[PDB]
Amino acid sequence: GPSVFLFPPKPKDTLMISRTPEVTCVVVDVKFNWYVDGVEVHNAKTKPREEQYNSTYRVVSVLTVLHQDWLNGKEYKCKVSNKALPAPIEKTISKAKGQPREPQVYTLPPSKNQVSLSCAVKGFYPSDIAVEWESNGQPENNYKTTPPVLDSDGSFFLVSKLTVDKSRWQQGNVFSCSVMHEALHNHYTQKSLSLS
Amino acid sequence: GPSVFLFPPKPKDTLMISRTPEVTCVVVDVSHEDPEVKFNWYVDGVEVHNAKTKPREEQYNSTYRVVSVLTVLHQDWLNGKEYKCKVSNKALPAPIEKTISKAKGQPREPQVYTLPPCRDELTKNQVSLWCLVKGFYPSDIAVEWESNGQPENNYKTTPPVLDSDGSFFLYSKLTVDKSRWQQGNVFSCSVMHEALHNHYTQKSLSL
Ligand SMILES: *[C@@H]1O[C@H](CO[C@@H]2O[C@@H](C)[C@@H](O)[C@@H](O)[C@@H]2O)[C@@H](O[C@@H]2O[C@H](CO)[C@@H](O[C@@H]3O[C@H](CO[C@H]4O[C@H](CO)[C@@H](O)[C@H](O)[C@@H]4O[C@@H]4O[C@H](CO)[C@@H](O[C@@H]5O[C@H](CO)[C@H](O)[C@H](O)[C@H]5O)[C@H](O)[C@H]4NC(C)=O)[C@@H](O)[C@H](O[C@H]4O[C@H](CO)[C@@H](O)[C@H](O)[C@@H]4O)[C@@H]3O)[C@H](O)[C@H]2NC(C)=O)[C@H](O)[C@H]1NC(C)=O
């Protein structure tokens, strides 16, 4: 039997009008219809088959979606037709339902040749969020962010850890944690870090 | 046909000689027509004979589920031995095997740091105390909080996250009333992991 998975756009893509958010309908184990709420839609695009180490083909259909539709909770339905199973499989997907809540951002200074800078982001809803670090308006590359964790009041939290040379912290370059979320003004805040 | 799921001990069970660690082999979707289930267990490929298999139990979907439990020695688990469960049922073309063991790689000692609440979280009447734990391997770990020898239940802990040098980190958030914080009470983050001495460290924080 063929098997259908359906994936949401990336958080960052929906929050910035410049980027193009996509809903992806993956099919493992070998047609495509798309609806947004009721309405049938056409702009979807299939991909070159990606054969597998287990005699599987992986066929992927990508539909581009409007930022505002996704944010407003519209529902995306991927009806996969084929021969190797009778009834056309449906999957469906939409943004998590509920009042979006604004992340609260707080940077925390270190307690070797390297120090760990922390950015704790709490109290936000839905869990869709993107975190990034920069210095002198330049992107950092030595950072990792935990997945969102469900807090006891139903909001989410996470922490981002940025690792830099003890020396850069030393002079007092300023380090900046960017956070993007639907509940923030312009979908974007920043908190700032350096030593005192 | 049937399905097999094999589950490891909890981290805390292998790290404390007082607790008893177990590996658990669960078979579901056993049919009525072919209800007998046989388990064979192997440690590092050598058959063992002390597992305890429970009587089959009918589910509401009218399939059976059968469970076999094998107690493991703390040190076998920490020495990376491999536990295999082989399940035989007359509906299967061949027996199902699953194997499990501690994640492979050289253990690394966790570094535990506490981080106090920020100033600006001192307008609400709750504060957030932070216990960063990084540089550990493998990812099996247990993190808890206490004050005055009593556990603090109001905390949440991230899953271990794969760091870029191959170790793991996580943070734990403890939420307390701002008062308790300001009276200058002492909060304790406690961490259990194989690469710690006595498998257990403890870091404190207050004003
Ligand atoms: C034969 O093998 C194939 C292929 O498998 C791989 O390739 C071969 C060569 C071997 O090496 C395999 O071992 C490899 O795995 C098998 O295909 C697999 O089948 C699985 C079962 O049918 C299927 O299970 C489901 O997994 C879901 C998660 O899928 C995610 O995440 C994993 C990463 O861990 C990844 O493998 C998948 O591709 C998929 O990854 C996401 O892809 C989407 C789509 O593009 C990304 O989203 C988009 O990203 C773009 C940017 O690129 C853009 O941002 C778009 O906006 C955005 O939409 C997304 O970001 C990717 N994630 C990342 C970062 O990795 C699980 O959710 C799910 O579990 C759920 O349901 C289960 C029931 O099955 C429950 O158990 C569970 O609780 C959950 O509810 C599914 O189980 C595998 O994903 C699939 N692997 C792939 C590669 O597709 C095939 O099965 C096998 N045949 C058999 C049956 O023998």
Ligand SMILES: *[C@@H]1O[C@H](CO[C@@H]2O[C@@H](C)[C@@H](O)[C@@H](O)[C@@H]2O)[C@@H](O[C@@H]2O[C@H](CO)[C@@H](O[C@@H]3O[C@H](CO[C@H]4O[C@H](CO)[C@@H](O)[C@H](O)[C@@H]4O[C@@H]4O[C@H](CO)[C@@H](O[C@@H]5O[C@H](CO)[C@H](O)[C@H](O)[C@H]5O)[C@H](O)[C@H]4NC(C)=O)[C@@H](O)[C@H](O[C@H]4O[C@H](CO)[C@@H](O)[C@H](O)[C@@H]4O)[C@@H]3O)[C@H](O)[C@H]2NC(C)=O)[C@H](O)[C@H]1NC(C)=O
């Ligand atoms: C017919 O019904 C059966 C039985 O189900 C119940 O009855 C039915 C009628 C319904 O009413 C249900 O509500 C009931 O649950 C169905 O059987 C299910 O099959 C599923 C696959 O079809 C299988 O899914 C897999 O589950 C794994 C998670 O299992 C955990 O977690 C869930 C809760 O999330 C839990 O329900 C399971 O019981 C199991 O719980 C763990 O139990 C272990 C073993 O005892 C515990 O381990 C021990 O713990 C003790 C202390 O207790 C000690 O510390 C020991 O040392 C230690 O070993 C552990 O603590 C428990 N954890 C939790 C969370 O409680 C998933 O891992 C797994 O995912 C993996 O496999 C996937 C492929 O399937 C991949 O996608 C994935 O990437 C992973 O690799 C599967 O999702 C269900 O577990 C199973 N339910 C039960 C009860 O076994 C049956 O499916 C249905 N049949 C039909 C035809 O409908």
